[PDB]
Curated annotation (Swiss-Prot), chains A, C:
Residues 1-89 are annotated as: Sufficient for dimerization of proICA512. The gene is PTPRN. It is found in: Cytoplasmic vesicle, Secretory vesicle membrane. The chain holds residues 469 to 557 of 979 of the full protein. ICA512-TMF regulates dynamics and exocytosis of insulin secretory granules (SGs); binding of ICA512-TMF to SNTB2/beta-2-syntrophin is proposed to restrain SGs mobility and exocytosis by tethering them to the actin cytoskeleton depending on UTRN; the function is inhibited by cytoplasmic ICA512-CFF dimerizing with ICA512-TMF and displacing SNTB2. This is ICA512-transmembrane fragment. Glycans are attached at N38, N56. It comes from the Eukaryota.
Length: 89, 91, 89, 91
């Protein structure tokens, strides 16, 4: 029951902005954003799981990639990314 | 500011001794000296750290991924629960 | 960007032993050891900074105290303390 | 062996003249005769010294603390960098 996390500077993080982060991330990792499932925004954090996918992208993979392209993610979504990781919710 | 790795626990607050024990276990797992974990702090429930240059070329992403793989061992050996692990960086 | 230093006879100083020194020191100065932050062991040396605290203990204060109780520190950590001070790292 | 004070510089090696200049500046700051700094040596980048009995009751802790307070003056007047200051004692 682990989830991927992207923690932002938002209070609160809007749901629309959270899934926009996922859209940009999905484009970058070459996966459909529909593969991000069980999505919730909780306080400043976006949380999600990941459906089975052809490239075998894990929660660790996508959260690592979110960290790598965070400036791209931010520029398009009007927020800052402070942490990315994996954990319970 | 540079990236840091972190582990959020269920401890209120996390003891310095327990935070370092997590790192000792993690170090032995990755076959790196625990002295290579640098700039360590415990703040509230969380442990934060960076990683020194090493021949293994282990990154913060590498170590936090590895912490996920050995999460049950980390918990069993320390008596605490790990709620989140990841990489952060201030704006 | 100054740090407190405790230089030991260790090669290398173990991280666990370094924070055990800090635990004993914290007990002696009546501060939480969690107030020792930015901790690194480098060769034989333990280095650290200090978070704001109620007694207004500085790096000079705690390194001076470490010198004063060094025999207590050593007896419990299986090492010798050779120097204490403040400096860059 | 008794405690000694020390100042580690960026000099490779530290000159005797520069080491003593640090002490002259430090002495004038603490309003003590620089002759009260005794058993002086420069070894590699470091200056080591002890302090003679004085009416002011100035200790090695006192003087090394004071060296921290006037670090920028010590550096500006000598042209070197101070990397560490402290008190040591052999085992
Ligand atoms: Ca993968
Ligand atoms: Ca940013
Ligand atoms: Ca658990
Ligand atoms: Ca004080
Ligand atoms: Ca001793
Ligand atoms: Ca300087």
């Amino acid at each position: 029951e682990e989830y991927g996390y992207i923690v932002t500077d938002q209070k609160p993080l809007s749901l629309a902005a959270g899934v926009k982060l996922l859209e940009i991330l999905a484009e970058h990792v070459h996966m459909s954003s529909g593969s991000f499932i069980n999505i919730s925004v909780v306080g400043p954090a976006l949380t999600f799981r990941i459906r089975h996918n052809e490239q075998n992208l894990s929660l660790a993979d996508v959260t690592q990639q979110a960290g790598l392209v965070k400036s791209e993610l931010e520029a398009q979504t009007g927020l800052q990314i402070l942490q990315t990781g994996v954990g319970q919710r």
